[PDB]
Amino acid sequence: MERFLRKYNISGDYANATRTFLAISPQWTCSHLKRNCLFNGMCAKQNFERAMIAATDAEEPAKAYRLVELAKEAMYDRETVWLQCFKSFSQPYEEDIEGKMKRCGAQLLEDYRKNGMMDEAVKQSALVNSERVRLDDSLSAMPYIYVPIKEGQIVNPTFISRYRQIAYYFYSPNLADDWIDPNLFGIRGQHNQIKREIERQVNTCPYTGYKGRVLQVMFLPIQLINFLRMDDFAKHFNRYASMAIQQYLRVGYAEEVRYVQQLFGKIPTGEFPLHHMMLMRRDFPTRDRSIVEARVRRSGDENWQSWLLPMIIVREGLDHQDRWEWLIDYMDRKHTCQLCYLKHSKQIPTCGVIDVRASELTGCSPFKTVKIEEHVGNNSVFETKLVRDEQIGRIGDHYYTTNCYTGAEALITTAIHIHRWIRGCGIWNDEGWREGIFMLGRVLLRWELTKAQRSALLRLFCFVCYGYAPRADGTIPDWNNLGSFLDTILKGPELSEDEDERAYATMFEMVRCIITLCYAEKVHFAGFAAPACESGEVINLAARMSQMRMEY
């Protein structure tokens, strides 16, 4: 193919089209209902290789750009481009897989280097120390901060525990008849007693060596202490309980509406919208009162995700008055992940997930509806065929797919989903490669890009393979500012015409190999057999050998 491009000096923008269509024209169906496609003997689309060699030494300067323009017009129906590209990648691509992946994996080093990514990565300290897994948004610990109040005064504690700044408070939740804001005026004097309580009972916090100074408190039930002694149960729970108080520490400030919005959706009018959403008489069959009483009264199990509060079943109740029955059913049966319960509740796969954080920065709307996919935790094989303007998304361990059109819209969604889940891994843990590059592949084939968006994805292959490399000090940098992230990705210098061809050749070949290994078929039928050996000269020889072996 290369002499066809180098002879006519076909530029790199056209050569992106011909490098795709050589793999597609072996199966590119066509019905020549308008007769423009035929090239003097045959379909030039369906026979793209033979017509290319025929147009090579014929030496026709018009017909070179004629065949590429006939190839670009072939590619416009991008939907069935994806059906033929992916199906052509599922059979064994019988070539040297590793050495092609090795050199193209070596070219993504220098592209990272000559980009400003390596200069930016030195500034990205405050490293990815052992909390590398990013927090979930459906799962929240905001109900446990409320004051447990009975008839007259706050319940005296039974057991006392502690984390780094937050204080734990164990009480039997059969007692407290109501729950009330810790920012209350009459309790504000009482509240600073109980901070002085805990550092007198339990000084420097048990889970880490940190000398004692308490500033917040959370009130917890009693049956949780039997689980919070267990070790891995603490690590998930503590950083999810301490996430609540930093939401709580902005409540008097002008930021707070964003935390109320992304966690809930609808916002109350009036002062304290956070508390006067979380604490209101809501529709129930059993105990017609606030939703913290719907959680605190109901127990948990060994799974740590059952104690915290699920938002997805909540936002059903906020918009339909049936759904409040379904909120109390989940808290009894105590399932772990949330989206699976809907699929087994005989429910349509559509539900809502909100992204107020990035949508205020760039995005169109934080609100969207998704199509769920199955609860997969072990298999990094995404194992799901995609069609009709869709894209992988992940919240929790459930994958989901989103209808998204006009792939500049679905460009940015990929830059966000990479920003969540590719962190912590790199050249060593390959679990971020084969899923991440598969996302980078689909956008590059299912949708149409412009010139500058080819400069965007080369930054992402340099980001997935090399963003979390251990730096010159051995420190592994942390990409956390989305305002520093997307402006580094989306805005940059425009690529050269010739380096477009060199980069897209490195993109498309790394795309094809990751699809090939995760979707090969190494099980086959035996295409041959050779039991052509002699009968007795094998058997009486092998029977002698055993008779010697048994002899002592």
The rounded distance, in Å, linking the Cα atoms of 538 and 549 is 17
CA 535 to chain CA centroid, Å, is 60
Domain boundaries, the chain: 2-76, 99-132+354-518, 139-337
In whole angstroms, what is the distance from residue 59 CA to residue 80 CA? 33
CB within 8 Å of 322: residues ≥ 6 apart: none
Listed resolution, Å: 4.0
* Amino acid found at 516: T
Helix axes 61-72, 12-24, angle to 10 degrees: 60
Q: After which residues is the chain broken (C to N over 2.5 A)?
A: none
Of 309, 278, 257, 265, nearest in space to 141 by CA:
309
Contact (Cβ atoms closer than 8 angstroms) between residue 183 and residue 251: yes
Report the C-alpha gap between 357 and 355 in whole angstroms. Answer: 5
Label residue 446 exposed, middle or buried (CB < 10 Å: 0-12, 13-18, 19+): buried
Q: Report how far apart, in Å, the C-alpha atoms of 66 and of each of 25, 34, 61, 422, 460 are.
A: 16, 17, 9, 43, 33
**Long-range contacts at 495-501 (CB < 8 A, ≥ 24 apart):** 495/451, 495/452, 495/454, 495/455, 495/458, 497/11, 497/12, 497/13, 498/11, 498/12, 499/12, 500/12, 500/13, 500/16, 500/451, 500/454, 501/11, 501/12, 501/15, 501/16
Is 18:74 a contact under the CB 8 Å cutoff? no
Paired with 353 in beta bridges are 368
Cβ neighbours, 10 Å, residue 46: 18
Q: What are phi and psi for residue 221, nearest 5 degrees?
A: -80, 175
Distance CA 356, CA 366 (A): 5
Element housing 415 (H / E)? helix 409-421
Sequence-separated (6 or more) residues with CB below 8 Å from residue 228: 161, 234, 237
| Distance between CA atoms of residues 106 and 185, nearest Å | 64
Between the alpha carbon of residue 495 and those of residues 5, 94, 501, the distances in Å are 19, 33, 10
Separation CA 284–CA 431 (nearest Å): 44
- Count, residues in the chain: 552
DSSP state of 145: G
> Which residues, at least 6 apart from 5, have a Cβ–Cβ distance to it below 8 Å?
15, 18
CB-based burial of residue 296 (10 Å sphere; 0-12 exposed, 13-18 middle, 19+ buried)?
A: buried
490 phi/psi in degrees, rounded to 5? -75, -30
The Cα–Cα gap between 34 and 19 comes to 25
User: Exposed/middle/buried for 1, CB within 10 Å: 0-12, 13-18, 19+?
Assistant: middle
Q: Are strands 147-149 and 139-140 parallel, antiparallel or unpaired?
A: unpaired
Do residues 196 and 129 lie in contact, with contact meaning Cβ atoms separated by under 8 Å? no
Distance CA 333, CA 335 (A): 6
DSSP assignment string, 255-296:
TTHHHHHHHHSS--SSS-TTHHHHSS----SS--S-HHHHHH
Whether 279 contacts 179, CB under 8 Å: yes
Structure tokens at 168: 């734990």
258/10 Cα distance (integer angstroms): 51
Q: Which helix (H) or strand (E) holds 119?
A: helix 117-122
CB 106 within 8 A of CB 506: no
Reading phi first (left if > 0) and then psi (alpha if -120 to 50, else beta), residue 157 is in: beta
Strand residue runs (E) in 150-193: 159-162, 167-171, 178-180
Give me Rg for the CA atoms of the chain: 31
Two structure tokens written together for 551: 């002899």
Q: Which of 7, 5, 2 is CA-nearest to residue 68? A: 5
User: DSSP per residue over 378-406, as a string?
Assistant: S---------SSEEEEEETTEEEEEE--S
DSSP label at 182? T
Look up residue 119 and give its amino acid.
D
